[PDB]
């Protein structure tokens, strides 16, 4: 007299209440520690409510071997005296034939796929349906709790990311589709997590982020190939290709996508995450605070590079409490893969040099605090020290701002101001702990931050003679192409000036930096390493200076209305001026964007001669309400993968009859 006809999980309503509406309207995705409502339908009318209520019990199971000691299986009754903090069910509305039941999960429940099962006394267990349980940044008792709604929207719900690339002095923001609410990302993430066998620890955000980071780094090492190859469409195709092997592989010039992929997996699981870019990052030192750079007599590097390099840019940051640490380390944690295992490092441990809190504090501290030493490499084979400009590491630590497409500088979270008292104290304490455990010429190099592609720049070299006697200096200037990770790509240009410097005189030399004078075109994704080396007389000391120059491509201007009505046609015009020296040939323009365009559309447009302007218009109809983003990519024979973006807020239609 108590048979069960069906069970409505009400996935649409619950997913909207549990901030999983972008995932699905059919499957139930709920966040732990928050009630969700199901409707239970009886085949026959229920005569007496209270005895029937006493007859029914609910069981929640996750995993292949669910048990109560693993906290993977919980049995609870349907009554108003259930523990709302724990697994509990209560009837909130009822009819003769249907019970509306509020079901609560504990704030520290194990995440993953769950089966909800109903037991009637003296009857077999019945499966009511499935649901997936995620971390809850909205729940104050949850370890991933975020104070601000804006921060929850940015670090969990926002699928349109910005990854900052380029150099410190020319930061190029790349539109990136995290796609954490793409339909299969949650399943892929949980299947990747199932490689770890300590499912009782899947309630802990620290353990999940540490496991996923080690697994994703292992997949990056297994799948990223040596070197369009550089055409990217966000984290989701990369994750699919890493887990399955099917799809376009990523090549080593874009190995920085690991941070974005990790951000996507964590955000999909419910852990707030952000992608952070650090410019001039000292990698591969093993905690050592010295970087050795080697240059030949022409201000150029002969080899591929040392193991310890200063990368032009290089991270995933995740938000959670740190219960197993001393107090005060809640908040932002850096996932750091070690070749392997993954350590979660609190950012303040890096800022305050708390080397010994976690095993990876030393390496993360060295990446943004090392000093570069430059050695001249002679034809004799001598390796000689150089008076060198200071090459600062850890510059312009950037991540996407909250609630806009702007760039937020977070460097002050990782480091005290240079030359300040606190930085002095931290560096002295770190150096002391490490120790216990174990000339007349001046060169000033002025360069532009960026060089227009197929364009011209002017560089300045200031030589000041401090001697009482005039000097015969040899000024070697070299331009070389470097990959983002400091790997030498191609020698481009070299000059050898011979100057006479008057005693006690400042001399300024201006040099034209021209693309057309380069011996070969810089490879794609590379940066210009400009060097100046001054040798005088027989002092054996060479003044040296270096700068990283970005390559600036033509600006892809997108003109679109700020507001747009859903289901009404919208026009976006795109303009691109050919500032290059050659016509743009084989020209393809692509448009995409979640909630604006299904997948993407590629178009061909006519060749654009130098000093001409392309102007393409596109009509499309937005179909999804909210803050959407249109991404436009332009390819030609002169350049490829030139992307820009623009945001449009899509409003619902005006209510009428």
UniProtKB/Swiss-Prot annotation:
Oligomer status and interactors: Component of the ankyrin-1 complex in the erythrocyte, composed of ANK1, RHCE, RHAG, SLC4A1, EPB42, GYPA, GYPB and AQP1. Interacts with SLC4A1 (via the cytoplasmic domain); this interaction is mediated by the SLC4A1 Band 3-I dimer. Interacts with ANK1 (via ANK 1-13 repeats). Interacts with AQP1 (via the C-terminal).
Organism: Homo sapiens (Human)
Molecular function in Gene Ontology: ATP binding; protein-glutamine gamma-glutamyltransferase activity; structural constituent of cytoskeleton
Disorder cited: Spherocytosis 5: Spherocytosis is a hematologic disorder leading to chronic hemolytic anemia and characterized by numerous abnormally shaped erythrocytes which are generally spheroidal. Absence of band 4.2 associated with spur or target erythrocytes has also been reported.
Keyword set, alphabetical order: Cell membrane, Cell shape, Cytoplasm, Cytoskeleton, Disease variant, Erythrocyte maturation, Hereditary hemolytic anemia, Lipoprotein, Membrane, Myristate, Phosphoprotein
Extra remark beyond the main annotation: The substitution of an Ala for a Cys in the active site may be responsible for the lack of transglutaminase activity of band 4.2.
GO cellular component: ankyrin-1 complex; cortical cytoskeleton; cytoskeleton; plasma membrane
Protein name, UniProt field: Protein 4.2
Protein encoded by which gene: EPB42
One Pfam family it belongs to: Transglut_N
Residues covered by region (Band 3 binding): 28-36
Role noted for this protein: Component of the ankyrin-1 complex, a multiprotein complex involved in the stability and shape of the erythrocyte membrane.
Gene Ontology terms describing biological process: cell morphogenesis; erythrocyte maturation; hemoglobin metabolic process; multicellular organismal-level iron ion homeostasis; regulation of cell shape; spleen development
Subcellular location field: Cell membrane; Cytoplasm, Cytoskeleton
InterPro entries: Ig-like_fold, Ig_E-set, Papain-like_cys_pep_sf, Transglutaminase, Transglutaminase-like, Transglutaminase-like_sf, Transglutaminase_animal, Transglutaminase_AS
Gene3D superfamilies: Immunoglobulins (2.60.40.10), Transglutaminase-like (3.90.260.10)
Sections of the chain in a coiled coil: none
PTM annotation (Phosphoserine): residues: 235
Topology versus the membrane: Lipid-anchor
Consequence recorded when altering residue 109 to T: In SPH5; Nippon/Fukuoka
Post-translational modification: Both cAMP-dependent kinase (CAPK) and another kinase present in the red-blood cells seem to be able to phosphorylate EPB42.
Protein family (similarity comment): Belongs to the transglutaminase superfamily. Transglutaminase family.
SMART domains to which the protein is assigned, alphabetical: TGc
